[PDB]
Amino acid sequence: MKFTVEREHLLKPLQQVSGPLGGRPTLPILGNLLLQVADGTLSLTGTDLEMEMVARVALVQPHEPGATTVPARKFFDICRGLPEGAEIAVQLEGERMLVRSGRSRFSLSTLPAADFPNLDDWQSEVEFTLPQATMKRLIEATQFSMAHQDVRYYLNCMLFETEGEELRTVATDGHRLAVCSMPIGQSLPSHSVIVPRKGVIELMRMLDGGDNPLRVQIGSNNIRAHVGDFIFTSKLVDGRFPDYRRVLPKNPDKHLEAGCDLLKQAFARAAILSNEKFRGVRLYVSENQLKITANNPEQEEAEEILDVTYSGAEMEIGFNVSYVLDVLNALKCENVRMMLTDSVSSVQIEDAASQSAAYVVMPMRL
Amino acid sequence: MKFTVEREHLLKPLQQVSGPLGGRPTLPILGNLLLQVADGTLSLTGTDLEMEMVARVALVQPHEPGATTVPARKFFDICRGLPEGAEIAVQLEGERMLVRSGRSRFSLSTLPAADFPNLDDWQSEVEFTLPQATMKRLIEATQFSMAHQDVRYYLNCMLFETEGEELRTVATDGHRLAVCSMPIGQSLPSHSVIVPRKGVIELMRMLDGGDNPLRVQIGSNNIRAHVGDFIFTSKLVDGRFPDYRRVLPKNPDKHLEAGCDLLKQAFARAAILSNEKFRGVRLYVSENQLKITANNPEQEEAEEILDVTYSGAEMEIGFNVSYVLDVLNALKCENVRMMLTDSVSSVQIEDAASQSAAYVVMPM
Q1: Which of A31, A80, A93, A266 has the most CB atoms at less than 10 Å from its CB?
Q2: For residue B283, what are the β-bridge partners?
Q3: Do A82 and B269 touch (CB under 8 A)?
Q4: Are residues B131 and B237 in the same domain?
Q5: Within this chain, do residues A108 and A200 fall inside the same structural domain, yes or no?
Q6: CATH number of the domain where residue A329 is located
Q7: Backbone phi and psi for residue A143, each to the nearest 5 degrees, phi listed first
Q8: What element of type H or E holds B132?
Q9: Contact A263, A336 (CB under 8 A)
Q10: How is this chain's protein used, per UniProt (chain B)?
Q11: A126-130 and A104-109: which strand pairing?
Q12: CB contact (8 A) between residue A303 and residue B104
């Protein structure tokens, strides 16, 4: 096996293919990457037995076909440590792989490609293509609301749902909820799958922000995403994800509109003197005015008054200010719409200019 | 006690004085700032009992004299969180401090100023002025070489030493040493003091880089630095700091010169295939060439060859690669000079273009 490639043509693929690698593998070859030279292409593969990333690099310089596996971290570090634009020549010599560039030379231990794990074959049932930017939007809009190591294991995941001509993501930790829906211009069966958090992070990070569209293929127990030279596959998780429809307020008719940053900054200052554990703050809403208060067990108190757009009935509502700030940080827009019902009901929050993403936080009695 | 001040005048002093607060809010008053309105000045003081920071802010608006103590991080966070250009009106009400700005209001808990610690009383014995940049250079050139948590407590500190015209810093962990001297244009007495790690961090943090010079006063048990309207004081440490003159090789007359970044990246690549526990690399020095090799228990091997300037006898030497990388990263320079003796002696390393700092590392 032999190839010679420029440093940067290797580095991006090396980054992607190292993502799935577990920190204490149960097999020695799991700490390795599979390298294969075949029909003018180098393929690199990394896996943890549940997800797998493959990257392809076109070979313009002389090469010899063959395959082996190499220590992931050491090979990546050697390649990263060489100077910008360096040419990296790789050749097998018995049971070592030789890496050479200028007068730098490295000899690495190898494990046979015959022993590299293979994911079982599976069939695609649902497929669609979409702009990279649309998938990044769906994931970034909702990822922060996934749980962390909840015993309710499905909450540590993200639901991906197809319906009509739309793709939708839902994330919830059992307390607050995010949902985002985007049209994709293809008629789809009504279908839902649950992707583990490690899978959503890898999928998000393979989207380079460019012009290559993303193709998704969904099977009974797996999902595959293909963009440009990268192909990612993850197992799906089996379970019963909460129905976002049941959590959305049925008629949140009283809309408060406010500047996003002005609102974020008032909540951030009030939060300093909120309860460190439960983080509760109170809203008093009246004609074009909002008052926010917070207090803590040390009897310290904050009060914020600001001009808003509001013409509903006067009312009072409390909630968790960390959850609200999470939402206002994700939204990054000009104006926000807070959609209110009463003191004993949830609040739905949206970009005032867009209904694509919606966030739900629960009321608190303060 | 009442004052009204623009956010912009309050924010950096608040940042400076509250910054260095870590060790224990078990004694709660140590997590609070002492505020005093006296003259037409607001003074802000933080202490951890070992070191003290004090900022003065002129009060140009109506104010009333008096003192209190408020939580430092909370008061900082509120001020930082208000909009650019905010005016901040503060007044004391029974036992809460009220803070009002625009339509934002905050009521903070207070502890009596009577409960705040006295910082201690001492006499200055050595005094000098110097550019902020020179203090930055002196600390940066040697800080990495301090021990981290040595039982020889003085090794986790930096020596400051005056001799002739020069201010000098020395740091060592028993394995490697850094020393840097800079002329400051004043005739100084010969004097050496040991400054704790926390004090050296604060000395670096207080530098705004700009035109204001630094004033230093040293007493038998304290050091003080004054820049602009900020004053930092630290207790000193007792102990017999090693003498750097005995660690410099007596006659390292094998001189090799190389590009700093090239040598750094060669060492960093070779380190990838060195023993994870020992981190050893081997140097082969010969006419105008340096070979660096490394290998590990798996028998994986790295080799780097570089062009170098070297005349004189061939020799081999081993090093902990981390120690040489640390020296090369601290040298922010074009070319380095390694000065060698033999295979079982220390190396001295310097900027090829300046003898103002030197680094000594022991061989493996």
Answers
A1: A266
A2: B292, B317
A3: yes
A4: yes
A5: no
A6: 3.10.150.10
A7: -55, -40
A8: helix B132-140
A9: yes
A10: Small molecules can bind to the hydrophobic cleft and inhibit binding of various protein factors, suggesting this may make and attractive antibiotic target.
A11: unpaired
A12: yes
> Quick one: B117 and B142 in the same domain?
no
Q: How close A119 gets to chain B, by Cα (Å)?
A: 29
Number of domains in chain B: 3
Q: Which residues form the domain of B135?
A: 124-247
Cβ contact, residue pair A74, B273, below 8 Å: yes
Asked if A303 and B265 come within 8 Å (Cβ–Cβ), the reply is no
Q: Which two tokens stand for residue B183?
A: 């002329």
Please indicate, yes or no, whether residues B277 and B364 belong to a single structural domain of this protein: yes
Nearest to B159 by CA among B134, B133, B185, B178: B178
Quoted resolution (Å): 1.9
Method used to obtain the model: X-ray
* Residue to substitute from B103, B290, B307, interface A, most A β-carbons within 10 A: B103
| Distance, CA of A154 to CA of A290 (rounded, Å) | 37
Picking from A228, A209, A224, A238, the residue whose alpha carbon sits closest to that of residue A134 is A209
Task: Give the N- to C-terminal CA distance of chain A in Å, as an integer.
Answer: 69
Among residues A138, A128, A140, A129, the alpha carbon closest in space to that of A212 is found at A129
* Closest-CA residue to B5 (of B51, B30, B40): B40
B109 neighbourhood in chain A, CB within 8 Å: 298-300
Q: Which two tokens stand for residue A114?
A: 């015959």
User: ∠ CA A295-A148-A135 to the nearest 5 degrees?
Assistant: 105
Terminal alpha carbon distance of chain B? 64
Which positions 286-315 of A are in contact with B (Cβ < 8 Å)? 298-306
Question: Do residues B310 and B362 share a domain?
Answer: yes
Name the domain boundary from A222, A247, A272.
A247
Tell whether A91 is within 8 A of chain B (Cβ): no
Which two structure tokens, joined as six digits, stand for B108? Answer: 């903070």
User: Is B81 close to A109, i.e. CB distance below 8 A?
Assistant: no
Query: Helix-strand-coil percent breakdown of chain B, rounded to 5?
Result: 20, 45, 30
Q: Are residues A6 and A72 in the same domain?
A: yes
Gap between the Cα atoms of A66 and B109, Å rounded? 72
